[PDB]
């Protein structure tokens, strides 16, 4: 659960720059994605 | 995790003053800073509680 908390705490602090365009917001919204499908794969 | 990925994009970002995101990763590092002096110092006394348990 600690790996998930790490890239959702890295991701709320990426929105604060207050450019939805950024790229490494998208980065961080894509590496979550993977990281909460790989989550539901196993449960 | 948060802090040694939030300190390289402050690294990446900022190679040249970039004037728009520069009144938002104060408040960024301010924020992150702050929460990192609060867990430490729990931590801390967590570990001496507990090595004076014995």
Same mark, same amino acid.
């Given at each position: 659960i600690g790996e998930i908390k790490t890239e959702t705490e890295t991701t709320r602090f990426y929105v +604060?720059?207050? +450019?939805?365009?950024?790229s490494l917001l998208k980065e961080a919204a894509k590496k979550m994605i993977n990281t909460c499908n790989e989550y539901q794969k196993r449960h | 995790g948060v802090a040694t990925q939030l300190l390289a994009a402050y690294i990446l970002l900022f190679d040249e003053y970039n004037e728009k995101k520069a009144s938002a990763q104060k408040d960024i590092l301010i924020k992150v800073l702050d929460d990192g002096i609060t867990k430490l110092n729990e931590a801390q006394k967590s570990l001496l509680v507990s090595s004076q348990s014995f």
């Open positions: +604060d720059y207050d +450019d939805l365009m950024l | -």
